[PDB]
Amino acid sequence: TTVVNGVNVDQLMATIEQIKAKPEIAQFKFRATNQWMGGTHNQATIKDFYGACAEDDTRKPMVFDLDEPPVLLGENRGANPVEYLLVALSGCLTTSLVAHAAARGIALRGVKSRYEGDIDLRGFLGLSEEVPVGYREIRVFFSIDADLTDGQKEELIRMAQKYSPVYNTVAKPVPVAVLLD
Amino acid sequence: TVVNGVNVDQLMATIEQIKAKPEIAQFKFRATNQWMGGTHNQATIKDFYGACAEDDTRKPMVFDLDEPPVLLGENRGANPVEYLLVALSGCLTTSLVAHAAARGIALRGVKSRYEGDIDLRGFLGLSEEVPVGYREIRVFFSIDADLTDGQKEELIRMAQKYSPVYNTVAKPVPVAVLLDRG
Ligand code: NA
After folding, report:
1. Are B112 and A34 within 8 A, CB to CB?
2. Which of A49, A80, A138 sits opposite B175 (nearest CB)?
3. What is the CATH number of the domain that holds B9?
């Protein structure tokens, strides 16, 4: 009665009450660093973050290699950056779905999902002023194993989207300032 | 003829082929994800489509996503909003380097740092006005090259202009999420 879907709902409840009292606690900052490794290969590191009124440098660094397939001028030294964007979207939607279900006391047995997005490289290459540079659209499907109706499953999915930071960062315009140091 | 480790001959060849046959430039990228309990889930990258053919030749790449303790996880992986920064960082870096290469501009080194801020009240449903996503993301590039600040700033402008992940963040991209019928 303290844990649903492997989420500690007591901790969730305490976090919500803490934020209601002191909204400043809810301000988080996430960070990365990246070093170019030649050609299409580069390496990103995740380490510290800020939140709940303090810097947190407690985690072992998490290192990621990004590259391209040969047709996009790389050697598959890692997944490509637009693939990493789908990874991020998939983790966020899944967590948002599961955590919102947990908060409602809705048990789920299994969750999986699939993702496909369309990109026309004429954008990246500056060959057409029509074509978007980014994803034109992304299509996601979820499968949920639970004692729920299809309508109730669809509701969980709508709530997942509504509360997902990565979903909303994709679907809405978010400003990105890129500067010389 | 290689600049910044980029095969510029292949690049120009690809461009000419696309001008003749624009459909070559249509790619589809994919992922699958399985929930692993709590805030932990796992994404897999394998196949893609592009240049008028399916490519299922790559070995799968698997990524673990989780949360720190204060965000209800157990450090079973970096969190999804961190992976978004990872994506952005790779894309801006490759776009910068590749566009420099196409112009014959050699770079000794490139590095960058990223921060975005988020108010959890969005995710937690505690405010209807608060953005659920990032409020803003800020990126700083350091470029080691035989270039003035203004020349570096031009490479950075072009990086952003032509970066798919930058434009996916900066612009509204439609995303349809549905219950699977297969
Ligand atoms: Na966006």
Report:
1. yes
2. A138
3. 3.30.300.20
